[PDB]
């Protein structure tokens, strides 16, 4: 299948409680491979070292610079706490070739600036992000980001995938069952379960007489089990007696074929 390497970085100011906390977490697909936390007694955690640690430390200082500049760009007081988030990295296909790169930011939960798919130009959300844009154009930042995303990112992802092929390239199918719970004399809940799967991407739906029931299905967010795998369920309320009109459909990369399940 296709794979991604992505960093999810958070920097959070906290006036009166020290310098902003920086945390960076790196993933291959849905597997964390590195963490750096500026508040850690022991910075970096892991499931040359030197050079990577230095980049995380410098990134801490860079995100603090960013937070200071952003406060000014929005005329904000020094009293409040603010959040800067970053996503960066690369997606490859089954052959290892670059599908696309990513380098983007959000401020206080709102998209701020992103490197376009061309890896050459920027999209700025507002007049503040236009300042960042002009700054980055003047310094030819996109070129540096492009070089990382097309070179180092893709090369490291390919090496990690190969070295970790027994886990990172293994899709574990869901274990599935349907449960049944009366809610009244007239109606019952059917709940379709998917347990033990990896990666997290899954589709779980109910149909009635072969028609999708999007509006009447309760679908919980996919959730981690803590052993690398994920869980999800989907529930529908059905009239008593009509249970066999309902089918649960399951698609996942680890299945040899899609599943159609019914109560018992």
């Amino acid at each position: 299948g296709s794979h991604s390497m992505r960093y999810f970085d958070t920097a959070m100011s906290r006036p009166g409680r020290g310098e902003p906390r920086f945390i960076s977490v790196g993933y291959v697909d849905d597997t964390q491979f590195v963490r750096f936390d500026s508040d850690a007694a022991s910075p970096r955690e892991e499931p040359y070292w030197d050079r990577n640690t230095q980049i995380f430390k410098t990134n801490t200082q860079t995100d603090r610079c960013s937070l200071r500049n952003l406060r000014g760009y929005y005329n904000q007081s020094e009293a409040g706490s603010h959040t800067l988030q970053s996503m960066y990295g690369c997606d490859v296909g089954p052959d290892g070739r670059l599908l696309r790169g990513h380098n983007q930011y959000a401020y206080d939960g709102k998209d701020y600036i992103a490197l376009n798919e061309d890896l050459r130009s920027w999209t700025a959300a507002d007049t503040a992000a236009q300042i960042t844009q002009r700054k980055w154009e003047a310094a030819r930042v996109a070129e540096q980001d492009r070089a990382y995303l097309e070179g180092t990112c893709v090369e490291w992802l390919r090496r990690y995938l190969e070295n970790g092929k027994d886990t990172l390239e293994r899709a574990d199918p869901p274990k599935t069952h349907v449960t049944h719970h009366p809610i009244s004399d007239h109606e019952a809940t059917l709940r379709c379960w998917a347990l033990g799967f990896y990666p997290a991407e899954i589709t779980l739906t109910w149909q009635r007489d072969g028609e999708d029931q999007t509006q009447d299905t309760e679908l919980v967010e996919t959730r981690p089990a803590g052993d690398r795998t994920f869980q999800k369920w989907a529930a529908v309320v059905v009239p008593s007696g009509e249970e066999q009109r309902y089918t649960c459909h399951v698609q996942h990369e680890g299945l040899p074929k899609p599943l159609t399940l019914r109560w018992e």
């Binding site: 990577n52 990134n59 490291w156």
Partner: peptide
């Protein structure tokens, strides 16, 4: 060589 990306100040 490094696997972590260098960032730039906004």
């Amino acid at each position: 060589r490094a696997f972590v990306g260098k960032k730039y100040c906004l």
